[PDB]
Amino acid sequence: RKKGKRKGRGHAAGQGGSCGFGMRGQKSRSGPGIMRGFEGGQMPLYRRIPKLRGIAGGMRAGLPKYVPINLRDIEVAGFKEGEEVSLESLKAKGIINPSGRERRLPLKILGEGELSTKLQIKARAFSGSAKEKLEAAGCSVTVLPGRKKYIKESVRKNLARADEYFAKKRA
Amino acid sequence: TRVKRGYIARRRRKKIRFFASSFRGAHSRLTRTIAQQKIRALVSAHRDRDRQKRDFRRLWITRINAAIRERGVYYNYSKFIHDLYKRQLLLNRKILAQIAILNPNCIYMIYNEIIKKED
Amino acid sequence: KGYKMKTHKASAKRFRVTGKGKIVRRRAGKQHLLAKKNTKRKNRLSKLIQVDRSDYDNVIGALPYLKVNRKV
Amino acid sequence: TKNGRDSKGQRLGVKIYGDQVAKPGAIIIRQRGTKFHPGKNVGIGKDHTIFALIDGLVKFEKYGPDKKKVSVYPREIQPENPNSYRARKRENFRLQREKKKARREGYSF
RNA sequence: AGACAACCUGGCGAACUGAAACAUCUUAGUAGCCAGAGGAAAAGAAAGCAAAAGCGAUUCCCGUAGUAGCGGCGAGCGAA
RNA sequence: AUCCCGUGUGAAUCAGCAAGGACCACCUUGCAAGGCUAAAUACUCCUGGGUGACCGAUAGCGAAGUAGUACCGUGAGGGA
RNA sequence: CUGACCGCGUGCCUGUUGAAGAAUGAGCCGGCGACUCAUAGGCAGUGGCUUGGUUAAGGGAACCCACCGGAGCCGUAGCGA
RNA sequence: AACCCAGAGCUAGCUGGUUCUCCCCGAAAUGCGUUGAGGCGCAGCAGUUGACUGGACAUCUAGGGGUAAAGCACUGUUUCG
RNA sequence: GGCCAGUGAGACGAUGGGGGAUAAGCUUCAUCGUCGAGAGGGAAACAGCCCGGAUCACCAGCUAAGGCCCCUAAAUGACC
RNA sequence: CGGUAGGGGAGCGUUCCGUGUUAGGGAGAAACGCGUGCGUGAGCCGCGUUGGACGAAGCGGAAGCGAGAAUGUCGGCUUG
RNA sequence: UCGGAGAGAGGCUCGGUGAAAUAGACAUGUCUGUGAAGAUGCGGACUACCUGCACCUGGACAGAAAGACCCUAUGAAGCU
RNA sequence: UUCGCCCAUUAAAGCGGUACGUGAGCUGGGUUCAGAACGUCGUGAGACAGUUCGGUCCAUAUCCGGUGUGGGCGUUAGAG
Ligand SMILES: [Mg+2]
Ligand SMILES: [Mg+2]
Ligand SMILES: [Mg+2]
Ligand SMILES: [Mg+2]
Ligand SMILES: [Mg+2]
Ligand SMILES: [Mg+2]
Ligand SMILES: [Mg+2]
Ligand SMILES: [Mg+2]
Ligand SMILES: [Mg+2]
Ligand SMILES: [Mg+2]
Ligand SMILES: [Mg+2]
Ligand SMILES: [Mg+2]
Ligand SMILES: [Mg+2]
Ligand SMILES: [Mg+2]
Ligand SMILES: [Mg+2]
Ligand SMILES: [Mg+2]
Ligand SMILES: [Mg+2]
Ligand SMILES: [Mg+2]
Ligand SMILES: [Mg+2]
Ligand SMILES: [Mg+2]
Ligand SMILES: [Mg+2]
Ligand SMILES: [Mg+2]
Ligand SMILES: [Mg+2]
Ligand SMILES: [Mg+2]
Ligand SMILES: [Mg+2]
Ligand SMILES: [Mg+2]
Ligand SMILES: [Mg+2]
Ligand SMILES: [Mg+2]
Ligand SMILES: [Mg+2]
Ligand SMILES: [Mg+2]
Ligand SMILES: [Mg+2]
Ligand SMILES: [Mg+2]
Ligand SMILES: [Mg+2]
Ligand SMILES: [Mg+2]
Ligand SMILES: [Mg+2]
Ligand SMILES: [Mg+2]
Ligand SMILES: [Mg+2]
Ligand SMILES: [Mg+2]
Ligand SMILES: [Mg+2]
Ligand SMILES: [Mg+2]
Ligand SMILES: [Mg+2]
Ligand SMILES: [Mg+2]
Ligand SMILES: [Mg+2]
Ligand SMILES: [Mg+2]
Ligand SMILES: [Mg+2]
Ligand SMILES: [Mg+2]
Ligand SMILES: [Mg+2]
Ligand SMILES: [Mg+2]
Ligand SMILES: [Mg+2]
Ligand SMILES: [Mg+2]
Ligand SMILES: [Mg+2]
Ligand SMILES: [Mg+2]
Ligand SMILES: [Mg+2]
Ligand SMILES: [Mg+2]
Ligand SMILES: [Mg+2]
Ligand SMILES: [Mg+2]
Ligand SMILES: [Mg+2]
Ligand SMILES: [Mg+2]
Ligand SMILES: [Mg+2]
Ligand SMILES: [Mg+2]
Ligand SMILES: [Mg+2]
Ligand SMILES: [Mg+2]
Ligand SMILES: [Mg+2]
Ligand SMILES: [Mg+2]
Ligand SMILES: [Mg+2]
Ligand SMILES: [Mg+2]
Ligand SMILES: [Mg+2]
Ligand SMILES: [Mg+2]
Ligand SMILES: [Mg+2]
Ligand SMILES: [Mg+2]
């Protein structure tokens, strides 16, 4: 506990008289100051610089759509062979503590670090490097189904007409 | 928690006032004046503890001058001092002034030594 | 319900932060009068520059929720 | 009629001098017309800015008989002075920093 | 029928101020006035949320979040 | 978009109608144009208990005595 | 305590390039009288945990407080409109 | 452009004031922009805290230059022959 | 680099100059010194000239600038 | 080891709370007045032919916490 | 011109009652010099016993607060 | 009005400083304050180093300074 400055008591003490505001003018006056981003009336830095690319128009900002995990973390943790990784078992060992936004998210696996064990992994996506190193080590990659996109019947007829075409052609 | 200033003021003031005893007039009464007067007192005091060291040397030198000038027609403070030094004596000016008043015969002797050797 | 500081929105559409924590901005002057600016210039005015240390104060003071390393 | 118009000094003039060191690309001279002419290992710019192509010492010469040209030559820096005043004092500073740091945690009581 | 501190509901409804001027904006649907009722009032039993998985009248607190957004894209305002 | 009002026009009944942030298709959800309802929440002219790193007569209520008194003001009001 | 006479000695504050100023302010004395609080952001100093840290409202033998309360929040991936 | 009360502790880049002691260090009155000029933003120059460093004070050498002096080779100017 | 201030009216003096009348204790720039924010001594008194940068005590000593008839410290010194 | 603006370090005191319904106190507390006492100072420690009932030190905590300036402000009393 | 005398109400003395603006402290000379460039207060000289009373108004940049004039303020209001 | 012109004299009808010397001694203008009118400028509110008529400066002398007039004390015993 360091004792506080009490301004305006004596000069011998500390900031006495003026209190360390020097002589007069606007900074030494009582009350709300001037806005923090404001330079004198010269056009402020933040104004004379152009708005950031996407933001500037109202294109929606970029947001993380997966909880990224590398293989580093999976190595460090206490996984014995046969163990199921998934999402749940990474909350269990606490390597991922997801918040609201992250609660609602899926999982993704990114290659970094070299795994040694056979583990059974369940996630909604992998990077290429990831599943390369994983299938190299002898780990079984269970990819989980995303939630179905609702498509009306007509566009099903179209996307199926496609598949019929490819199929009649190859066969 | 409300805090009246209470006695903390009047002690300070009183202790100041004690200083200013025997100042003529309102320098011994009004606190506000007394303050200033205290500072100035302390200040002159400090100044004249320094003046002092100058002043007594002034004095002593003067007395020495008079004490010597009695002897020779041509003799001075300056001449004397110069001779004290080329004779290697250490007596400083307080001592020669005090021996000048309090033991005048002594200073005559000293002068006779200085002359004999300068002869 | 206290009062929490408000992000100055007109500064947060301008500046942002890189992964290592330094502030960056766009460069000024590509919107019009391009024909008469040489292509070399036009390229220079298209990149992202780290904000000049001097301004960091004002910037920082208006974007209290921006995570920023000043390299201490 | 009425005066009082003028211009910021353009910052022209010799940036690196004779027998100093120059990086590649480093500007030696910003001039209006060509008061200096490009010598060897040295490029000239559109505004007649003279700049270096090579690391090395820059040297001014008589283009002849009147004018002047600047050129850059590669130097050799082998002579690192092993035992000399420069080295001695700099070493001293190093050693004193190390010593005075080691006798801190190296303090009893 | 009149009386009734604050709270509440409805009706009328500013200005200084902030924006380093000011007119859009802010102050603020604040103060003030008028009317009304209660120990609370108002709201309230999905023509509601949500998103392809689900909830199950209203009010209040924490949080989401100073986020998405709004804005002489300025000062500022600001959800679900 | 959703919501609610001036002026003018002006539908459909469940094979419907509305909502899902212009609008159209599809699917999901819901049933406007009749009412009424407790609690959790706000407040102190107050009543009864309790506590106080609250005041102690220039403080604490304006008011520890004729205190909204004396006095001032035509009056609203000021006010020891 | 008094004070013969000698020496030195241009009230205080404010504010100014600069004042003893004939620059402002105070009749004198005693009281009252000013960088405060709430909430957030940054930084520093101290602790606590680092088997990552922490709980909010809420509940509590009235308060405090034991013990709960992981919803949240901060740190673990960036680049890109 | 009445008065009283209320918004209202309006607002005042302005003037006044801002209270205990000792120790260490210690400026500036410049540049740029400003509806700016007695205000403010950044820079310059304090303090405190860290990280790198090896200088500073002297001594000699080397660079480029177009001032003082000097000159009439150019540009003007000028007297007489 | 971090955290976090004041300052952004300067004054004269030396030197280089511009404006002005090679007027101004005028004005405006450039390289320096002092004052500002500096007490002590010399300058009769006397911010900015000269000496000197005040931790403190001493009724000690040596000097700087400047001085040695009396006021008032030191020579009513010496030789031209 | 001069110092204004200004920054940093180290302290003193006031009222209150914890220890504490403390030690001490009508064999005289706070306060008031005094000191050949001790501190770099803020102050401390001691003393009373005053005063008449409270209240230290230590180790900690909190502020309505220190005044000579506001043509401050309220009382008291001068000058003329 | 060029003033004179007189009467009343004061002024003046004595008894009774008894204010006010003002006021840092005042032990409050002149000349000259200095100095923020007009000094009782700094220097050098000069002059001055202490203290009343009546008169006089040269000084104290005398006294009665924002300077009506000039400028400033991104002040206020009235008016076109 | 500074300036200046004239009349009649006169020895002559000097020029300057003293904050217009002198407004806490007096009085006119001037700071053309608010009313009004003329010329002129302005669409206009209004304006004028244009003119015109009207238009509030107070004062009990504290100190110094002054003109007078006393007391005290000194003048080495006291007096006229
Ligand atoms: Mg504090
Ligand atoms: Mg401090
Ligand atoms: Mg002060
Ligand atoms: Mg400060
Ligand atoms: Mg001030
Ligand atoms: Mg300032
Ligand atoms: Mg303000
Ligand atoms: Mg405000
Ligand atoms: Mg703001
Ligand atoms: Mg755009
Ligand atoms: Mg992004
Ligand atoms: Mg997270
Ligand atoms: Mg109390
Ligand atoms: Mg107080
Ligand atoms: Mg004495
Ligand atoms: Mg990151
Ligand atoms: Mg474009
Ligand atoms: Mg800053
Ligand atoms: Mg040029
Ligand atoms: Mg080319
Ligand atoms: Mg009724
Ligand atoms: Mg009624
Ligand atoms: Mg009722
Ligand atoms: Mg408005
Ligand atoms: Mg307005
Ligand atoms: Mg405004
Ligand atoms: Mg404004
Ligand atoms: Mg209820
Ligand atoms: Mg109801
Ligand atoms: Mg139901
Ligand atoms: Mg129903
Ligand atoms: Mg709807
Ligand atoms: Mg919706
Ligand atoms: Mg409506
Ligand atoms: Mg209709
Ligand atoms: Mg129908
Ligand atoms: Mg609709
Ligand atoms: Mg629905
Ligand atoms: Mg229906
Ligand atoms: Mg409807
Ligand atoms: Mg219904
Ligand atoms: Mg109802
Ligand atoms: Mg009383
Ligand atoms: Mg009272
Ligand atoms: Mg009392
Ligand atoms: Mg004396
Ligand atoms: Mg004297
Ligand atoms: Mg001035
Ligand atoms: Mg004065
Ligand atoms: Mg001044
Ligand atoms: Mg002044
Ligand atoms: Mg006062
Ligand atoms: Mg006064
Ligand atoms: Mg007064
Ligand atoms: Mg206080
Ligand atoms: Mg503040
Ligand atoms: Mg706070
Ligand atoms: Mg904080
Ligand atoms: Mg820690
Ligand atoms: Mg709790
Ligand atoms: Mg509870
Ligand atoms: Mg509770
Ligand atoms: Mg009015
Ligand atoms: Mg206010
Ligand atoms: Mg308001
Ligand atoms: Mg205003
Ligand atoms: Mg120093
Ligand atoms: Mg300077
Ligand atoms: Mg201003
Ligand atoms: Mg600055």
Ligand SMILES: [Mg+2]
């Ligand atoms: Mg520094």
Ligand SMILES: [Mg+2]
């Ligand atoms: Mg050369």
Ligand SMILES: [Mg+2]
């Ligand atoms: Mg040369």
Ligand SMILES: [Mg+2]
């Ligand atoms: Mg040449």
Ligand SMILES: [Mg+2]
């Ligand atoms: Mg020349």
Ligand SMILES: [Mg+2]
């Ligand atoms: Mg020549």
Ligand SMILES: [Mg+2]
């Ligand atoms: Mg020629």
Ligand SMILES: [Mg+2]
């Ligand atoms: Mg020629």
Ligand SMILES: [Mg+2]
């Ligand atoms: Mg400037």
Ligand SMILES: [Mg+2]
């Ligand atoms: Mg200036």
Ligand SMILES: [Mg+2]
């Ligand atoms: Mg200033």
Ligand SMILES: [Mg+2]
């Ligand atoms: Mg000068």
Ligand SMILES: [Mg+2]
């Ligand atoms: Mg000069």
Ligand SMILES: [Mg+2]
């Ligand atoms: Mg020249």
Ligand SMILES: [Mg+2]
């Ligand atoms: Mg000449």
Ligand SMILES: [Mg+2]
């Ligand atoms: Mg000149």
